[PDB]
Design a protein around this ligand. Structure first.
Ligand code: HEM
Ligand code: HEM
Ligand SMILES: [C]OC(=O)[C]C1=C([C])N(C(=O)C234[B@@]56[B@@]78[B@]9%10[C@@]2%11B92%12B7%109B857B925B673B%11%1254)C2=[C][C]=C(O[C])[C]=C21
Ligand SMILES: [C]OC(=O)[C]C1=C([C])N(C(=O)C234[B@@]56[B@@]78[B@]9%10[C@@]2%11B92%12B7%109B857B925B673B%11%1254)C2=[C][C]=C(O[C])[C]=C21
Ligand SMILES: *[C@@H]1O[C@H](CO)[C@@H](O[C@@H]2O[C@H](CO)[C@@H](O)[C@H](O)[C@H]2NC(C)=O)[C@H](O)[C@H]1NC(C)=O
Ligand SMILES: *[C@@H]1O[C@H](CO)[C@@H](O[C@@H]2O[C@H](CO)[C@@H](O)[C@H](O)[C@H]2NC(C)=O)[C@H](O)[C@H]1NC(C)=O
Ligand SMILES: CCCCCCCCO[C@@H]1O[C@H](CO)[C@@H](O)[C@H](O)[C@H]1O
Ligand SMILES: CCCCCCCCO[C@@H]1O[C@H](CO)[C@@H](O)[C@H](O)[C@H]1O
Ligand SMILES: *[C@@H]1O[C@H](CO)[C@@H](O)[C@H](O)[C@H]1NC(C)=O
Ligand SMILES: *[C@@H]1O[C@H](CO)[C@@H](O)[C@H](O)[C@H]1NC(C)=O
Ligand SMILES: *[C@@H]1O[C@H](CO)[C@@H](O)[C@H](O)[C@H]1NC(C)=O
Ligand SMILES: *[C@@H]1O[C@H](CO)[C@@H](O)[C@H](O)[C@H]1NC(C)=O
Lengths: 551, 551
């Protein structure tokens, strides 16, 4: 019955009911005007016919290697171009945040309640005739059929960008500090009240957990020594609650910041590495400041590790994902002379698009062993068996799977994928093309255009009938990938602004924070500004083994 | 023992211990360099000799009535100058926030923990030899002696700006939504987790309280009718927790958003007025949107009332306080093309400086009655006796007291004033001159310069011995006022930036919020943009009595 069910307002204009059968669109500062905000202004037209498509920019950034080879060696040009790149991802995310799963309109409840995931697009109203609004049938196609037809992996499809398990597990570990759904409340709620990179997955969400994890000497975290190697402490030793099956021995119940990192040895690997890094930084700082107490050492170390995290994510992780020849640079100073809100609210769609389970292989190859999913899950005895060095050397060698392209979701976690669909419907997500229009992307006019392929497109056309009823998540998983790339256009163009707000929106990137004294002086600052995955592993793993995000 | 005890770093440079007996100043982006950041740059020198003093600007804004009479009638000039005024209060407050009572250095605990008041200046370290750092004696002078010698009121000193009781109670009411100290935790802690103007003192801090206060019909708040007049509901009807003496009858235990507003009839007056305003706006919106449900009506009404509150605060409240001939304007669009952080964390010093208890008269004069403090406190039967109309008519006539100039704190609240001293020392506040330097003000070289008077200055010199040991709050209360004004320089130049961050930092002032559709269309937007204390009283108080913030 709601006259806004068809999402009539275009170009981010806001829809408002003006009666039972009438609507009005607020076209304030959209650059457009008219009934549904479709008539462009002069400056709008000018900026329109002069704006390059994301595929053109991507092509430019993945080609002309010599030009970028010259650019990367000129600090001025590199800084300028990096500033342009940062700018291109700005002004796409509502900050301060607006809607959530319970509010299709702006309200103080939606703004103040930090328990909600925020929403890039408002949910479809409950009284709408169809799940997507007014288009499509009364019900969306069977999620099981979608899953089995176009999502489930027949044969392992390797990532053409050469991503490995170091990358996959880094992605899981890193994202699971702000993607922490409160299943007690619902899919649209989060337990990560920090809504960003606070390293709560290392230090704990609450203060009591943090204290239980701390040694309260030299700023360090508690740890145990097995076979001369440093590992996280146990649940029995710290009373830190962790999620483990009842058949897991006490000496194998490692306790870390995030309570679910006992699930995968790959997660416990990075947990251990980051623990060791925190204590290392504590040693360095203690040597620099012998007059410092435990608390200051701990806090400063935490800030430093946050810095390292953002640094590595930008210049290694995203650098690998992008396939750019241009070297991305982590430098907050590039945003000081521009408008930028230093705050962030984790979006539900950001969570949804980051379900990169196709990265997972059928088996996990460590040294000379091939473990199944059943054998690998909740098995830290594997980590103790092979050790951190062998784990790094093995995960560096094993290639991960392609995320986009379709049919590469491992069967072992099929129930997860289906959930990603079901919950998406439960949270009343708008359609794919709506989210593309939301991020200034051209809507798909057919399923073949979406897939760049005829078979899966035919299946999807049989299931959804209309392209404007296609859902976001499976579209993300079956989308035509960029040339020999892991992702398609939608994944990148949606994930990048969210990532920008989630990284550069961190308070340590603010002018009053971004200075040496914040991190204990020039030494800590240098620890941040010289951070890399290779340096992390080299400094914290025995023998300094070679590591990378690609095979 | 801490080498930073003497506060060596000048011009907002940051001090860091580099050993047990050495320190270093981070002068990053301060405009200065050298050991303690005292050596200015060329551009810094240029900006320094061209910057007018706050007293000069105050003079220019409080004189030349004809010129300003011309300015206020030209939208362009008024917008320009208002933009300048807004800009002059920017770049003073740390946003995102930094320090608090327990952290004199930046840390994630200080940033993320919302239970803290933030701090404009870091606290004096615990191991410092003197309360202020290194200057002064081992202990600050007796707070009772300071109180009795320069703070306590002898004869009532009226405000030369003619501020009335409507103004005073509006001040208390408005400020007590973000000034809510958690005395269970300590004076450095707050219960206002929203840290700003969320109107929690009307709608309740939490969701349960709000839901208890709501009618869940037409978006309205619950209310009762007494003698034909609308008043807030009872504790018996809503089960809302309020603070009342044990002898207060159940039919007099009114339930409002803030648990302490029943202790002062002046507060209950405004609580009633704002309740009525909310329900009125609910009626208007319901007429505009017959298709809307209870929840959206409620939320939209809330946002609108926030708007009205900020509007009234800027164009009537602060307009009266300033004494400017220039007409201040509430317009978020003035900041849309400038760097501004739409977030706010309430500072402890902001709380301290806003203790304007000298505003209180010896008696409260209503119609033909003069109530003492003992008679006026916890007595809402007075409000029911005279009614809202007579209350407004009386409080409009009765003049309030001067805040600066010394010796005007009423004896009935001496215990409060003393606390303001004691707790200030408990939270380890830095000295008056440190806070003056922090906000780009010239340090006082004597107590006579501070007071502009010989007697109180002599007493203060006998007490503190050194002017650099003078505390912030009593200095605020005894400071030489501006010519025929209520405040001194420090009060204004410290209070104004805090207020800027507290008013324009509100999310409804952000470009994605500041639009008609946020407030249910052009009608609600007009309600916000045409709000005033006069219209607020006229719309909701019977007879539409004339009101103002001055006599
Ligand atoms: C052995 C490897 C993995 C397993 C067994 C696994 C399994 C799961 C499970 C069971 C969930 C929770 C489903 C639910 O709560 O409804 C989940 C959620 C998720 N997984 Fe994976 N996953 C793995 C690796 C990864 C990887 C490599 C990524 C890549 C970034 C990833 C991203 C996510 C995300 C974003 C969520 C949503 C979690 C939340 O909102 O709290 N996972 N995974
Ligand atoms: C009408 C009579 C008033 C009384 C009886 C009164 C009394 C008090 C009391 C008892 C406190 C708490 C002090 C403590 O717990 O240590 C207090 C706090 C305060 N008062 Fe007043 N006050 C009055 C009016 C005002 C006015 C007009 C203002 C200024 C607008 C004001 C501003 C404050 C502030 C800012 C606080 C601290 C709030 C907090 O931290 O929770 N009060 N007042
Ligand atoms: C989840 O999102 C992703 O898949 C990772 C990703 C990010 C992030 N970006 C970026 O565009 C960024 B984000 B970071 B860094 C570089 B700078 B900084 B923010 B600015 B913006 B720009 C890209 C760009 C291209 C590609 O592959 C085609 C992937 C990614
Ligand atoms: C407690 O603080 C006060 O004493 C209230 C106060 C505020 C606030 N301002 C301001 O300068 C501001 B900041 B905010 B708002 C008003 B507008 B907006 B920014 B523009 B600028 B202008 C002044 C200016 C002068 C005076 O007294 C002479 C008092 C105040
Ligand atoms: C944020 O919103 C959620 C959902 O509206 C609130 O959780 C509800 O809290 C009430 C008690 O006030 C319970 O009766 C409900 O069962 C809860 N619902 C869910 C889904 O958990 C939550 O309290 C809000 N948070 C804040 C800080 O107000
Ligand atoms: C914010 O800081 C306060 C003070 O450190 C925390 O409250 C303390 O919490 C510990 C429990 O972890 C208690 O034992 C202390 O008694 C509390 N102190 C006081 C004075 O309240 C509070 O938990 C912190 N908030 C968050 C969200 O971490
Ligand atoms: C300013 C214009 C510069 C154009 C540079 C060449 C950009 C060509 O961009 C093309 O975009 C296509 C879109 O589908 C992709 O499929 C191709 O891979 C890509 O080459
Ligand atoms: C206001 C009632 C308490 C004040 C009396 C105790 C403190 C005495 O204080 C004295 O008060 C004198 C008279 O005001 C002043 O002239 C002196 O400067 C002051 O020291
Ligand atoms: C868009 O506007 C046109 C005319 O301005 C109107 O015919 C059309 O119905 C609008 N779109 C929707 C979805 O209502
Ligand atoms: C866990 O891993 C070990 C190898 O160290 C293996 O022997 C064991 O069977 C695994 N546990 C399960 C339940 O498969
Ligand atoms: C400020 O610097 C000067 C010279 O560099 C030095 O003499 C002085 O001691 C410093 N200030 C403090 C408080 O130490
Ligand atoms: C409260 O005020 C009434 C007048 O309205 C007065 O009669 C009564 O004595 C007062 N109560 C107290 C305790 O002073």
């Amino acid at each position: 019955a709601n006259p806004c069910c068809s999402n009539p307002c275009q170009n981010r204009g806001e829809c408002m009911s003006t009666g039972f059968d009438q609507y009005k669109c607020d076209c304030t500062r959209t650059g457009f005007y008219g009934e549904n905000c479709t008539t462009p202004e002069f400056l709008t037209r000018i900026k329109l016919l002069l704006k390059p498509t994301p595929n053109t920019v991507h092509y430019i950034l993945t080609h002309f290697k010599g030009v970028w080879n010259i650019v990367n060696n000129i600090p001025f040009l590199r800084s300028l171009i990096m500033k342009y790149v940062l700018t291109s991802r700005s002004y796409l995310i509502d900050s301060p945040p607006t809607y959530n799963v319970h509010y299709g309109y702006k309200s103080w409840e939606a703004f103040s309640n930090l328990s909600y995931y925020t929403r890039a697009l408002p949910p479809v109203a409950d009284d709408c005739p169809t799940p997507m609004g007014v288009k499509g049938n009364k019900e969306l196609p069977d999620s099981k059929e979608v899953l089995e037809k176009v999502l489930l992996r027949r044969e392992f499809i390797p990532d053409p960008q050469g991503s490995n398990m170091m990358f996959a597990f880094f992605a899981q570990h890193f994202t699971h500090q702000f993607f922490k759904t409160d299943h007690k409340r619902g899919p649209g709620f989060t337990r990560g009240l920090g809504h960003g990179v606070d390293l709560n997955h290392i230090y704990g969400e609450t203060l009591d957990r943090q204290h239980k994890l701390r040694l309260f000497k030299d700023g360090k975290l508690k740890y145990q020594v097995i076979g001369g190697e440093v590992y996280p402490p146990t649940v029995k030793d710290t009373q830190v609650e962790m999620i483990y099956p009842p058949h897991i021995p006490e000496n194998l119940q490692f306790a870390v910041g995030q309570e679910v990192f006992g699930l995968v040895p790959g997660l416990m690997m990075y947990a251990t590495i980051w623990l060791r890094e925190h204590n290392r930084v504590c040693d360095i700082l203690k040597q620099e400041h012998p007059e410092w107490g435990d608390e200051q050492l701990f806090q400063t170390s935490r800030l430093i590790l946050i810095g390292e995290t953002i640094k590595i994510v930008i210049e290694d992780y995203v650098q690998h994902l992008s396939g750019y020849h241009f070297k991305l640079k982590f430098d907050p100073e590039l945003l000081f002379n521009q408008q930028f809100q230093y705050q962030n609210r984790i979006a539900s769609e950001f969570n949804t698009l980051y379900h990169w389970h196709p990265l997972l292989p059928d088996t996990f190859n460590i040294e000379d062993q091939e473990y199944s999913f059943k054998q690998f899950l909740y098995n830290n005895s594997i980590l103790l068996e092979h050790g951190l060095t062998q784990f790094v050397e093995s995960f560096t060698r094993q290639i991960a799977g392609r995320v986009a392209g379709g049919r590469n979701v491992p069967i072992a976690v099929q129930a997860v994928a289906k959930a990603s669909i079901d919950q998406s419907r439960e949270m009343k997500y708008q359609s794919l093309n709506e989210y593309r229009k939301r991020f200034s992307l051209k809507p798909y006019t057919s399923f073949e255009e979406l897939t760049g392929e005829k078979e899966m497109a035919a299946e999807l056309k049989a299931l959804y009938s209309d392209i404007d009823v296609m859902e976001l998540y499976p579209a993300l998983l079956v989308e035509k990938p960029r040339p020999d790339a892991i992702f398609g256009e939608t994944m990148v163009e949606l994930g990048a602004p969210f990532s920008l707000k989630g990284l550069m929106g961190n308070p340590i990137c603010s002018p009053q924070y971004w200075k040496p004294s914040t991190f204990g002086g020039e030494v800590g600052f240098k620890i941040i500004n010289t951070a890399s995955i290779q340096s992390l592993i080299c400094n914290n793993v025995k023998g300094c083994p070679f590591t990378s995000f690609n095979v």
